[PDB]
Amino acid sequence: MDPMICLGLEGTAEKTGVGIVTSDGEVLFNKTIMYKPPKQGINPREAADHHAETFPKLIKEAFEVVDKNEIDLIAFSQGPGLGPSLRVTATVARTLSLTLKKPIIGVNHCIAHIEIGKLTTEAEDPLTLYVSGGNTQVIAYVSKKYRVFGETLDIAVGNCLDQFARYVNLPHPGGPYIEELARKGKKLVDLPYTVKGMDIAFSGLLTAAMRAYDAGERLEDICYSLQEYAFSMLTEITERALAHTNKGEVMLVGGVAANNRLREMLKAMCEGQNVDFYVPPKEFCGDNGAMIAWLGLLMHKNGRWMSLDETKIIPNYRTDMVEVNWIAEADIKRDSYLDFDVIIKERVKKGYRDERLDENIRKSRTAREARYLALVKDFGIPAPYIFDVDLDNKRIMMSYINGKLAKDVIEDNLDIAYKIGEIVGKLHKNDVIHNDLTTSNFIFDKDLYIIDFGLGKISNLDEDKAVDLIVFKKAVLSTHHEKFDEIWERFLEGYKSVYDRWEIILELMKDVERRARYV
Ligand SMILES: [Mg+2]
C-alpha cells in the first residue's frame, strides 16, 4: 500500500484521456483518444458526445492493467475548458468515486500540464508557455500562486491554425499540413504582428492570412508567414515574461508544442537569454490523464478534500484561483557631458526570428516610438524629448529622465496610478492607442513620464481603447497583485478626469473580456 495510486480523467477539450499514477511519480497507465469532428453541417456532434463514448472504453483498458481496488484516489480536470466536455468528465469521475467509494479531487488542467512537466523533465521552477487549441498563456509560480503573465486576448494559437487549415481546405488536424507547407515557403507575406504588453491576439492575423489566400498568395508562403508571425509573437511575450518573473528556465507545453518550428524558435530565444528549455515527452505534452492524476495526488497527498458538491466544473478556472499546497528588447545607454545628459535606446536584434521580420519589427517600433514620444507633448503628457534618430541602426537619442520606474514606486505611493490614468485618458481622447500600458513604461520624478511607445497606433475605434485598458488591467493583476484593486480603481479615477467617453469603453471592456469559455 506504500505508493498511493490515483486515476485521473482529462476531458477539458477535444481529447479523452485516462491516467493512472502513483504518489511515487510512477505512471502505470496513460492513454488518450481524440475527437474526430463530423461535417459542420446538420446532424451535429460535440466533443462531449465523443467523451461519453470514449471514457468507458479507456477505463476498461485501465482496469485491465491495474486492479481497480488498488486505486485510492480519483481525479478529473475541473477546468478550464468546454462546459459540455467538463460535465461528461465530471459525471464519469463522480460515478467512479461513488462506486469505488474513494475520494475525488477536481484539478486545474492548466497547472496540471506544468506539474507533469516538472515531474517528467529536468525543469523545477520554469516560466512555461502553454499552447493548445483552446489555451495559450504564459504561466509561472510566483508569490505562492501559479499566475498568468501573458495570455491570448481572443482565440488560442491552436485555434488560429485550425481555422486557417479549414479555410484553405486542409483535413483535420491541419496543423501538420501547415507545418509542412511552411517549410517549402520563402516569401514573408505582409501580416499583422500583434503583441500588446505581455498578451497577444491572433484574430487579425488569422483574417489577414485568409485575405492573403483570397488574393492569390502562394499557400506555402502564407503558411510559412502564419507560423513565423504567430510563433515570434509567442516567443516575444515569453521573452518579456522571462525578463519579468526572473526565472532561469522555460518549459513549452501543450499540443502545439508538437510543432518543430515553434520548438526551435523557442530554443534559440532561450539560448540567447542563457536559460534552460524543456519540453515534456509527447504523451505528457498534449492533453492527457496522467497529469490530472499526478496533480490530484499532489493536492490530496498534501491533505485536501472535495465534497461531491465541490466538484462542480469551472469552465473559466483561472490559475490564481488554485491554492498551492505542494511546493529585454532594448539596450539603453547614458551619455554625459559635464551637465547635459542624453540616452540612446537601441532595439537589438532577436536571433530567434526570421531576419526579415526582425528588421521590420525593430525599424518600425523605433520609428513609431520616436514619432509618438514627440507627438504626445501636444496633449500635455511628459515624455523624453527626442533629439535624433538613426533608423538604420534602430537607435534613438532622447532626453534623460532621472527617477524610479512606476513598477518600483507605485505600491508605496498609489497616487501615481492616477497620473497613469490621466495620460491614458489624454491618449484616447486624442485617438492614440498605446498598446503596451504597464508600470515598467512610466518613470516617476515630480510628474509622471511615459517612456515607451513602440507599439502605438492611431485609432478611433472603441474596441481598441477597450483592449488598451484590459492590457493595463491584466498587467497590473499579474505584477501588482498585492495592491491590484486599488491601483485600478485610481487608474479609472484619472482616466475619468480627462476622457468623457470613459463609460462607453469601460462597458465595452466587458463584452470584449467575454472572449472566454461559454458558461
Ligand atoms: Mg491541455
Q: Is residue 276 domain-shared with residue 286, that is, in the same domain?
A: no
Residue 452 grid coordinates: 515607451
C-alpha span between 114 and 140 (Å, rounded): 9
AA letter at 283: E
Cis before residue 384, ω within 30 degrees of 0? no
C-alpha span between 17 and 34 (Å, rounded): 9
255 labeled part of a ligand binding site: no
What Å distances lie between residue 171 and 10, 174, 221, 310, CA to CA?
25, 6, 19, 40
Helix (H) or strand (E) holding 8: strand 5-10
Contacts of 389 (CB under 8 A, 6+ apart): 366, 367, 370, 395, 396, 397
CA angle 388, 393, 399 (to 5 degrees): 30
AA letter at 253: V
Residue 11 grid coordinates: 476531458
Residue 157, judged by CB atoms within 10 A of its CB (0-12, 13-18, 19+), counts as buried
Query: Ligand 1 center to residue 276 CA distance, Å?
Result: 22
Cβ pair 465, 433 in contact under 8 A:
yes
CATH number at residue 393: 3.30.200.20
Q: What are phi and psi of 292, to 5 degrees?
A: -60, -50
Query: Ligand 1 center to residue 110 CA distance, Å?
Result: 6
Query: Ligand 1 center to residue 364 CA distance, Å?
Result: 36
Q: What are phi and psi of 457, to 5 degrees?
A: -165, 140
Q: Is residue 165 domain-shared with residue 306, that is, in the same domain?
A: no
Q: Is residue 266 domain-shared with residue 338, that is, in the same domain?
A: no
Cβ pair 138, 128 in contact under 8 A:
yes
Q: What is the resolution of this structure in A?
A: 2.7
**Nearest by Cα to 357 from 166, 137, 192:** 192
Cβ pair 425, 498 in contact under 8 A:
yes
**Nearest by Cα to 111 from 154, 87, 80:** 80
CATH number at residue 466: 1.10.510.10
DSSP state of 40: S
Q: Is residue 342 domain-shared with residue 475, that is, in the same domain?
A: no
Cβ pair 171, 159 in contact under 8 A:
no
C-alpha span between 335 and 465 (Å, rounded): 37
Query: H helices within 101-146, ranges in order?
Result: 109-120
Residue 448 grid coordinates: 509622471
Residue 426, helix vs strand vs coil: helix
C-alpha span between 219 and 17 (Å, rounded): 34
End-of-domain residue from the set 401, 420, 450: 401
Cβ pair 39, 255 in contact under 8 A:
no
Query: H helices within 39-156, ranges in order?
Result: 47-65, 83-100, 109-120
Cβ pair 441, 423 in contact under 8 A:
no
Query: Ligand 1 center to residue 256 CA distance, Å?
Result: 10
The experimental method behind these coordinates is X-ray
Residue 110 grid coordinates: 492548466
Residue 169, judged by CB atoms within 10 A of its CB (0-12, 13-18, 19+), counts as exposed
What Å distances lie between residue 109 and 106, 128, 497, CA to CA?
9, 14, 42
Phi-psi region of 274 (alpha: psi -120 to 50; beta: other; left: phi over 0): left
End-of-domain residue from the set 366, 401, 436: 401
CATH number at residue 114: 3.30.420.40
Active site residues: 436
Q: Is residue 265 domain-shared with residue 129, that is, in the same domain?
A: yes
Sheet of 136-142: strands edge to edge?
A: 145-151, 136-142, 127-131, 249-253, 276-278
For every residue of 258-319, DSSP letters joined together read G-HHHHHHHHHHHHHTT-EEE---HHHHSS-HHHHHHHHHHHHHT-----GGG----TT--S
End-of-domain residue from the set 290, 320, 350: 320
Q: Is residue 272 domain-shared with residue 127, that is, in the same domain?
A: yes
C-alpha span between 465 and 429 (Å, rounded): 10
Number of domains in the chain: 4
Cβ pair 315, 79 in contact under 8 A:
yes
Q: Is residue 13 domain-shared with residue 94, that is, in the same domain?
A: yes
C-alpha span between 215 and 435 (Å, rounded): 29
Cβ pair 234, 195 in contact under 8 A:
no
Pairing between β-strand 457-458 and β-strand 5-10 as defined by DSSP bridges? unpaired
Q: Is residue 105 domain-shared with residue 86, that is, in the same domain?
A: yes
C-alpha span between 513 and 503 (Å, rounded): 16
C-alpha span between 133 and 166 (Å, rounded): 14
131 labeled part of a ligand binding site: yes
Q: What are phi and psi of 329, to 5 degrees?
A: -85, -30
Q: Is residue 127 domain-shared with residue 252, that is, in the same domain?
A: yes
Residue 189, helix vs strand vs coil: coil
Cis before residue 80, ω within 30 degrees of 0? yes
Contacts of 426 (CB under 8 A, 6+ apart): 379, 380, 381, 498, 499
| Length of the chain, in residues | 519
Residue 179 grid coordinates: 507545418
Contacts of 335 (CB under 8 A, 6+ apart): 341, 342, 343, 344
Query: Ligand 1 center to residue 254 CA distance, Å?
Result: 6
Cell 470584449 belongs to which residue? 512
C-alpha span between 167 and 219 (Å, rounded): 11
AA letter at 166: R
Q: Is residue 311 domain-shared with residue 342, that is, in the same domain?
A: no
Query: Ligand 1 center to residue 287 CA distance, Å?
Result: 4
Residue 87 grid coordinates: 460535465
Cβ pair 132, 287 in contact under 8 A:
yes
**Domain assignment of residue 500, given as a range:** 402-519
AA letter at 444: F
3-state helix, strand, coil in the chain (%, to 5): 45, 20, 35
C-alpha span between 365 and 298 (Å, rounded): 45
Cell 487549415 belongs to which residue? 165
Residue 444, helix vs strand vs coil: strand
C-alpha span between 481 and 479 (Å, rounded): 6
Q: Is residue 259 domain-shared with residue 131, that is, in the same domain?
A: yes
C-alpha span between 174 and 164 (Å, rounded): 9
AA letter at 367: A
DSSP state of 256: G
**Nearest by Cα to 191 from 352, 357, 350, 348:** 357
Give exposure, 126-148, as e/b (b: 16+ Cβ within 10 Å).
Answer: bbbbbbbbbbbbbbbbbeeebbb
CA angle 399, 405, 407 (to 5 degrees): 150
C-alpha span between 128 and 356 (Å, rounded): 27
337 labeled part of a ligand binding site: no
Residue 217 CA, distance from chain mean position: 30
DSSP state of 326: -
Contacts of 225 (CB under 8 A, 6+ apart): 185, 187, 188, 189, 191, 209, 212
Q: Is residue 356 domain-shared with residue 422, that is, in the same domain?
A: no
